[PDB]
């Protein structure tokens, strides 16, 4: 009865809704809209800081890197606070997962490709997983703005949670090394209002958001249940219809989530 449920979703909040749950050894896969592209928004950076965590070992964190006011282009909520003092890039990694910092982005995606290979070294790096789907064109701010049905700067709730299976459940990471991802996401501030508050609280829910424009609210989720049994939901949805300004119902990245909590109980 998911399609069902989500249909009235999508009719009552007017918005494309995806969600993608990976079948475990007793669930079943939930699936809607599951391979239709949504832009990445934010949630580019959680598998973003995975790639500048797997390419260096974990002393590369400590080294400080200078920014300026004028590399915020971008809500820069953590960064903006060193405007001279340059930060660690395992800062910048707290600050774009956690506080989901513009700036940060683009130091981290410069970090890894350079200047001008930032954005193709990060896709490469999302292929280097399997997803041979997803892709980043553009940096901060310019990623969150493309039109709706452009395939730049897009994922998919099935690419990106297969994504997410294997940096926090499978072996793309290090015990360690993912050890501090997983550990961003728990302590991430932004997805209170979104497949957090669509599972019970003695659930463990670790998220990373992404809004943009028309309309664009995303969550993907790792979940664990009272049994421990673990769990990726990948949330997306637009609402591009109402042009550029739509406003993003977050509640529905929420609604949706007491569904596949309805079935995942
Ligand atoms: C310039 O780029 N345009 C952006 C933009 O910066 N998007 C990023 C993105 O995905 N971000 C995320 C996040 O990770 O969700 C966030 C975190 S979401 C959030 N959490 C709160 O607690 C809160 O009080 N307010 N908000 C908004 C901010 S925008 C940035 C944007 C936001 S709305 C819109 N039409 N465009």
């Given at each position: 009865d998911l399609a069902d449920r989500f249909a009235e979703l999508e009719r009552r909040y007017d918005a494309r809704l995806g969600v993608y749950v990976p079948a475990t050894g007793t669930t079943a896969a939930i699936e809607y809209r599951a391979d239709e592209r949504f832009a990445f928004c934010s949630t580019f950076k959680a598998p973003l800081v995975a790639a500048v965590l797997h390419q260096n070992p974990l002393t590369h964190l400590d080294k400080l890197?200078?920014?300026?006011?004028?590399?915020?282009?971008?809500?820069?909520?953590?960064?903006?606070?060193?405007?001279?003092?340059?930060?660690?890039?395992?800062?910048?990694?707290?600050?774009?997962?956690?506080?989901?910092?513009?700036?940060?982005?683009?130091?981290?995606?410069?970090?890894?490709?350079?200047?001008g290979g930032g954005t193709a070294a990060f896709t490469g790096y999302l292929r280097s997983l399997g997803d041979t789907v997803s892709r980043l064109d553009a940096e901060e701010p310019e990623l969150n703005r493309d039109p709706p049905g452009d395939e730049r700067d897009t994922t998919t709730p099935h690419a990106i949670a297969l994504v997410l299976q294997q940096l926090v459940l499978g072996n793309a990471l290090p015990p360690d090394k993912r050890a501090l991802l997983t550990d961003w996401m728990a302590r991430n501030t932004t997805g209170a209002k979104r497949i957090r508050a669509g599972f019970p609280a003695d659930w463990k829910v670790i998220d990373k958001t992404g809004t943009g424009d028309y309309g664009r609210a995303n969550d993907i989720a790792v979940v664990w249940s009272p049994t421990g049994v673990p769990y990726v939901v990948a949330v997306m949805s637009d609402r591009a219809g109402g042009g550029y300004d739509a406003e993003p119902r977050e509640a529905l990245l929420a609604e949706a989530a007491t569904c596949v909590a309805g079935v995942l109980a």
């Open positions: 890197i200078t920014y300026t006011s004028d590399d915020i282009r971008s809500i820069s909520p953590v960064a903006q606070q060193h405007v001279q003092t340059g930060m660690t890039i395992g800062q910048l990694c707290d600050a774009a997962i956690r506080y989901s910092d513009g700036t940060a982005a683009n130091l981290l995606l410069a970090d890894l490709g350079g200047p």
